[PDB]
């Protein structure tokens, strides 16, 4: 009889079940994203098969699907293995350590240990390891009360805390980091339990043909730095922006962006470009503040120089609509002017670089890349060269000389992250 691996290879497709959420798998007009989506896509490529994503609305359904006749090959969904073995399911080697955290609302008193969870309105996801944690606690503190939802995602639980619908929830630290940027009031109360490893889940039984390939792949993903890169993209917001930076973005998202969103959308539509990337530029430049001012005379929401403003037909840099339109037009123009050899998505990142440092200094970095045997059409390569423009040992012999290339790297990195954050916004219940 055909093995699990042989079935997949024969069918030419790897069916992967997951949750529908930015952390795992998420659809947006510009494509599909998610930590689990990208990791599973790489695994399917390793196997030389097509990835087919299936989703479940809660964990019970996810595990039921995995254990059904005709079910998917594996589940990739930020799964925490249960405390006890169950014949219905087997787990891979773990690929991410996360820490469960009790989450509370700033403005209310912070519980600091498990006993403080008594007397609170708590909600967690049904069928979760988090629910098990509380069930175990309830044996010690019978007055403990908590509710379980089988019809929402973690973003919804965190929103409930943010607006005061509940007092507390319990989530994985990576989920908190990803969502901190949406909820200005949520805070970590304390770490509840030891860190644990997330793992892919396979059907029960004694067929190890696919499992061994999964584990070989995960080890390779770790070695290549793929796990780290995905971790940083999806779960790195607090690591990179800082914790205060993260919940401060959340405040600005709630209070400032609604004042300007229509302008960004208007400009994006007329320029045929994603408004959320435009908005991300605006956040990095001014934190969405139309009266902002840099040290060097640059002003406004999109931080246009007077030269750029004039060139774009901006007559008032301090007017949010004009700044947005001018900055957006400029970004689009310089993206269009990039060498044809630079392809998307890299092309957009090079355009961000040029927005900040100008096309001339950017060309110097591309020339440097080529000289170093790197690919001048790949952003990740040229990004390595940009900081050299701030160092005399490198910039003195370049055509255009000194430039703050380190700043530019930071600029592009931050805008790309804010762009992701805006793309991953979901609607409340
Ligand atoms: C939107 C805009 O006006 N960008 C201009 C950019 O300003 C940057 C400058 C930066 C800035 O002022 N950073 C702060 C420096 S400091 O903290 O005040 O010292 N912010 C602006 C947009 O990202 O400088 C470059 C390079 O000269 C210009 O390229 S060039 O015309 O081809 O030379 C580019 O036009
Ligand atoms: C140290 C730091 O974090 N500074 C931030 C500042 O960036 C400066 C230039 C820096 O990193 O040294 C940043 O200000 C904007 O930075 C972008 C480039 O990333 C510039 O193009 C803008 O002109 C700058 N705007 C202003 C008003 O200075 C701001 C917020 O993004 O935060 C600073 O803490
Ligand atoms: Cl999420
Ligand atoms: Cl620099
Ligand atoms: Cl980057
Ligand atoms: Mg749902
Ligand atoms: Mg999980
Ligand atoms: Mg210069």
Question: Closest Cα to atom 23, ligand 1: which residue?
Answer: 356
Separation between Cα atoms, residue 367 and residue 216, nearest integer Å: 39
Name the percent of the chain in helix, strand, coil, to the closest 5: 50, 15, 35
Question: Closest Cα to atom 29, ligand 1: which residue?
Answer: 358
HSE-up of residue 320 (Cα within 13 Å, Cβ side): 21
Q: Tell me how crowded residue 240 is: count the other CB atoms within 10 A of its CB.
A: 15
Strands 50-56 and 13-19: parallel
Give the closest ligand to the alpha carbon of residue 363.
1
Location of structure tokens 């009889």: 1
- The two most distant CA atoms of the chain are separated, in Å, by 74
Method: X-ray
- Please check whether residues 150 and 285 belong to one and the same domain: no
Location of structure tokens 């991300």: 280
Separation between Cα atoms, residue 229 and residue 417, nearest integer Å: 13
Separation between Cα atoms, residue 100 and residue 98, nearest integer Å: 7
Q: Name the domain boundary from 184, 215, 235.
A: 235
Strands (E), 173-307: 186-191, 196-198, 201-203
Cβ–ligand 2 distance for 21 under 6 Å, the answer no
Location of structure tokens 């990835």: 51
What is the C-alpha radius of gyration for the chain, rounded to an integer number of angstroms? 24
- Please check whether residues 295 and 162 belong to one and the same domain: no
Separation between Cα atoms, residue 49 and residue 46, nearest integer Å: 8
- Please check whether residues 354 and 290 belong to one and the same domain: yes
* d(CA 304, ligand 8 centre) in Å: 15
Any idea what DSSP says for residue 108?
B
* d(CA 406, ligand 4 centre) in Å: 3
Which ligand 1 atom lies nearest to the CA of residue 354?
A: 29
Tokens of 269: 């539509």
Separation between Cα atoms, residue 323 and residue 299, nearest integer Å: 9
- Please check whether residues 14 and 2 belong to one and the same domain: yes
- Please check whether residues 65 and 205 belong to one and the same domain: yes
* d(CA 57, ligand 6 centre) in Å: 5
By residue count, the chain amounts to 429
Q: Name the domain boundary from 138, 161, 194.
A: 194
175 is catalytic: no
Helical residues (DSSP H) of 313-345, grouped into ranges: 320-337
Which ligand 2 atom lies nearest to the CA of residue 293?
A: 27
CB distance 40 to 46 below 8 Å? no
Strands (E), 41-132: 50-56, 74-75, 89-91, 96-98, 100-105, 123-125
- Please check whether residues 408 and 290 belong to one and the same domain: yes
Beta bridge partners of 14: 51
Question: Closest Cα to atom 8, ligand 2: which residue?
Answer: 407
Tokens of 54: 């299936």
Give the closest ligand to the alpha carbon of residue 390.
4
Q: What is the resolution of this structure in A?
A: 1.6
CB distance 24 to 78 below 8 Å? yes
Tokens of 312: 């774009």
* d(CA 257, ligand 4 centre) in Å: 29
At 52, give phi and psi (nearest 5°): -120, 115
Beta bridge partners of 171: 101
Closest C-alpha among 193, 224, 197 to residue 45? 224
CB distance 172 to 179 below 8 Å? no
The dihedral built from the CA positions of residue 290, 348, 382 and 41, taken in this order, carries a sign that is positive
Any idea what DSSP says for residue 103?
E
Query: Which residues fall inside 5 Å of ion ligand 8, going by CB?
Result: 403
Which ligand 1 atom lies nearest to the CA of residue 358?
A: 29
Tokens of 383: 């990004």
Which ligand 1 atom lies nearest to the CA of residue 295?
A: 18
Separation between Cα atoms, residue 319 and residue 314, nearest integer Å: 9
Per DSSP, the residues of 129-176 read HHHHHHHHHHHH-TT---EEESS--HHHHHHHHHHTSSSBEEEEHHHH
Q: Tell me how crowded residue 169 is: count the other CB atoms within 10 A of its CB.
A: 29
Question: Closest Cα to atom 10, ligand 2: which residue?
Answer: 407
Separation between Cα atoms, residue 169 and residue 122, nearest integer Å: 5
Q: Tell me how crowded residue 212 is: count the other CB atoms within 10 A of its CB.
A: 11
Separation between Cα atoms, residue 65 and residue 298, nearest integer Å: 56
- Please check whether residues 211 and 242 belong to one and the same domain: no
- Ligand 1 first shell, C-beta below 6 A: 294-296, 298, 303-305, 308, 327, 330, 355-360
Give the closest ligand to the alpha carbon of residue 389.
4
Tokens of 203: 């059907």
HSE-up of residue 199 (Cα within 13 Å, Cβ side): 16
How far CA 207 is from CA of 13, 115, 119, 309, 405, in Å, comes to 18, 44, 47, 65, 53
Who contacts 46 (Cβ-Cβ below 8 Å, separation ≥6)?
213, 217, 220
Domain that holds residue 262: 236-429
Say if residue 178 is exposed, middle or buried (CB neighbours under 10 Å; 0-12, 13-18, 19+): buried
Tokens of 234: 């999806």
Location of structure tokens 């000389």: 401
At 214, give phi and psi (nearest 5°): -55, -50
- Please check whether residues 178 and 326 belong to one and the same domain: no
- Please check whether residues 181 and 251 belong to one and the same domain: no
Q: What is the dihedral of CA 332, 338, 342, 348, to 10 degrees?
A: -30
Count of structural domains within the chain: 3
Q: Name the domain boundary from 178, 210, 235.
A: 235
Who contacts 157 (Cβ-Cβ below 8 Å, separation ≥6)?
123, 124, 125, 149, 166, 169, 171
- Please check whether residues 134 and 207 belong to one and the same domain: no
Cβ–ligand 2 distance for 241 under 6 Å, the answer no
Strand order, beta sheet including 50-56: 50-56, 13-19, 74-75, 201-203, 89-91
Domain of 174, CATH number, reads 3.40.190.10
Separation between Cα atoms, residue 337 and residue 334, nearest integer Å: 5
HSE-up of residue 400 (Cα within 13 Å, Cβ side): 19
How far CA 390 is from CA of 47, 277, 336, 407, in Å, comes to 44, 27, 27, 9
Cβ–ligand 2 distance for 228 under 6 Å, the answer no
Tokens of 29: 């007009």
Separation between Cα atoms, residue 167 and residue 63, nearest integer Å: 29
How far CA 358 is from CA of 113, 232, 245, 295, 353, in Å, comes to 53, 28, 27, 18, 7
- Please check whether residues 270 and 404 belong to one and the same domain: yes
Location of structure tokens 């990142």: 349
Separation between Cα atoms, residue 137 and residue 115, nearest integer Å: 9
Tokens of 100: 């469960």
- Please check whether residues 341 and 268 belong to one and the same domain: yes
How far CA 225 is from CA of 30, 62, 170, 231, 385, in Å, comes to 25, 28, 29, 10, 21
């Amino acid at each position: 009889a055909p093995t699990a691996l042989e079935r997949v290879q024969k069918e030419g497709v790897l069916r992967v079940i997951t949750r529908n959420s930015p952390a795992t798998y998420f659809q947006d007009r510009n494509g599909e994203t998610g930590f689990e989506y990208e990791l599973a896509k790489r695994f399917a490529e390793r196997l030389g098969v097509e990835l087919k994503i299936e989703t479940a609305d809660n964990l019970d359904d996810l595990y039921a699907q995995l254990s059904r006749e005709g079910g998917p090959a594996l589940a990739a969904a930020g799964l925490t293995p249960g405390r006890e073995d169950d014949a219905s399911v087997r787990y891979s080697h773990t690929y991410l350590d996360v820490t469960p955290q009790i989450i509370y609302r700033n403005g209310q008193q912070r519980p600091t240990r498990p006993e403080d969870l008594v007397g609170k309105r708590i909600m967690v996801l049904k069928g979760s390891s988090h629910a098990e944690q509380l069930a175990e606690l309830k044996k010690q503190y019978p007055e403990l009360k908590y509710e379980e939802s089988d019809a929402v995602e973690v973003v919804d639980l965190l929103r409930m805390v943010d607006v005061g619908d509940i007092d507390l929830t319990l989530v994985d630290s990576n989920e908190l980091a990803m969502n901190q940027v949406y909820f200005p009031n949520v805070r970590v109360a304390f770490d509840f339990g030891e860190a644990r490893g997330l793992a892919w889940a396979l059907p029960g039984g004694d067929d190890d043909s696919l499992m061994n390939e999964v584990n070989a792949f995960l080890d390779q993903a770790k070695k290549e730095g793929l796990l780290q890169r995905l971790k940083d993209r999806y779960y790195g917001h607090v690591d990179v922006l800082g914790y205060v930076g993260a919940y401060t973005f959340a405040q600005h998202l709630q209070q400032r962006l609604p004042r300007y969103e229509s302008h960004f959308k208007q400009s994006g539509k007329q320029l045929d470009t994603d408004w959320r990337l435009l908005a991300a530029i605006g956040y990095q430049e001014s934190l969405w503040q139309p009266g902002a001012t840099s040290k060097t005379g640059v002003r406004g929401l999109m931080m246009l120089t007077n030269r750029t403003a004039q060139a774009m037909g901006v007559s008032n840099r301090l007017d949010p609509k004009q700044s947005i339109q001018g900055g957006s037009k400029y970004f689009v123009q310089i993206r269009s002017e990039l060498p044809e050899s630079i392809k998307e998505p890299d092309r957009s990142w090079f355009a961000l670089a040029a927005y900040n440092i100008g096309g001339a200094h950017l060309e110097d970095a591309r020339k440097m890349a080529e000289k170093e045997g790197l690919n001048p059409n790949k952003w990740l390569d040229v990004k390595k060269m940009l900081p050299r423009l701030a160092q005399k040992q490198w910039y003195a012999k370049t055509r255009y000389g000194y430039a703050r290339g380190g700043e530019t790297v930071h600029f592009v990195q931050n805008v790309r992250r804010y762009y992701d954050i805006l793309t991953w916004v979901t609607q409340p219940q």
